[PDB]
């Protein structure tokens, strides 16, 4: 009979213990009540399974040869145009994509391995849309273009912009429309340490670090402006980011 194999994306597939006359393995899977079935030339659970929803939408589950990745697709009833695609990759990142009546991407939600998310909605043919990053404790809102995602926090005359390039690189900037040189904030970005250093009146005031854990930390310089003091504090609420910009 069969062997159960654990899949990425909280799924299971049952694979036949031995092969058929063609050398092939039977695959069976239930996905949210829908029975899928398939045949594979490998013995490990990898391969393609198919089924059809009660509304006649076609479904396909594709499991990569190394079991690292699953793709779950729903199609219109003639199987030609995508309706939804959910891809869990070997680093457990999820991409959940919705398509327009013409099967072109309209919405994409990325869930990172740590549970933080990028939510892109109202995606248009040029790759532009609306964006939101959902972090632990707070959300950042902005826009998407084919160049970059730009999330924005505003506080007084100060605008902080977090940019995620098309390839995933982060960079951050600060603009202040204050003209009083005593009080106007400016900032320099170090992409090497992923640190935004803020300055007021030729004195460093604080370092904002945009971490590889998708957190933001704040650490103040001493009253001189010369050197850091105390220790970095993790932002836990959008107000604490706003405070850092005061």
Same domain, 230 and 182: yes
Q: Provide the CB-side half-sphere exposure for 219 (13 A, CA).
A: 14
Resolution (in Å) of the shown entry? 1.6
Same domain, 242 and 153: yes
Same domain, 217 and 116: yes
CA distance 47 to 36: 12
Q: Which of 66, 100, 134 is the last residue of a domain?
A: 100
CA distance 110 to 188: 29
Q: Which of 50, 85, 100 is the last residue of a domain?
A: 100
The SS3 assignment for 225 reads: coil
Closest CA to 83 of 68, 70, 96, 98: 98
Question: Could you tell me the residue range of the domain that residue 232 belongs to?
Answer: 101-246
Q: Which of 48, 70, 100 is the last residue of a domain?
A: 100
**Across 89-230, where does the E strand assignment appear?**
94-99, 105-111, 117-121, 129-135, 138-144, 148-155, 158-165, 170-176, 185-190, 195-200, 203-210, 216-220
Same domain, 139 and 236: yes
């Amino acid at each position: 009979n069969s062997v159960s194999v654990d899949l990425p994306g909280s799924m299971k597939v049952l694979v036949s213990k031995s092969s058929n006359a063609d050398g092939k393995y039977d695959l069976i899977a239930t996905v949210d009540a829908l029975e899928l079935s398939g045949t594979s030339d490998k013995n490990n659970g990898s391969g393609v399974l198919e089924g059809v929803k009660a509304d006649a939408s076609k479904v396909k589950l594709t499991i990569s040869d190394d079991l690292g990745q699953t793709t779950l697709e729903v199609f219109k009833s003639d199987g030609s145009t995508l309706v939804s695609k959910k891809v869990t990759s070997k680093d457990k990142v999820l991409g959940d994509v919705k398509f327009n009546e013409k099967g072109e991407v309209s919405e994409k939600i990325i869930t990172r391995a740590d549970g933080t998310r990028l939510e892109y909605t109202g995606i248009k043919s040029d790759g532009s849309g609306k964006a939101k990053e959902v972090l632990k404790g707070y959300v950042l809102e902005g826009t998407l273009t084919a160049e970059k995602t730009t999330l924005v926090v505003k506080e007084g005359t100060v605008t902080l912009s977090k940019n995620i390039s098309k390839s995933g690189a982060v960079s951050v900037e600060l603009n202040d429309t204050d003209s009083s040189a005593a009080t106007k904030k400016t900032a320099a970005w170090n992409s090497g340490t992923s640190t935004l250093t803020i300055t007021v009146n030729s004195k460093k005031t604080k370092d904002l670090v945009f971490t590889s854990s998708n957190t933001i930390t704040v650490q103040q310089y001493d009253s001189n402006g010369t050197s850091l003091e105390g220790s970095a504090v993790e932002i836990t609420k959008l107000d604490e980011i706003k405070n850092a910009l005061k």
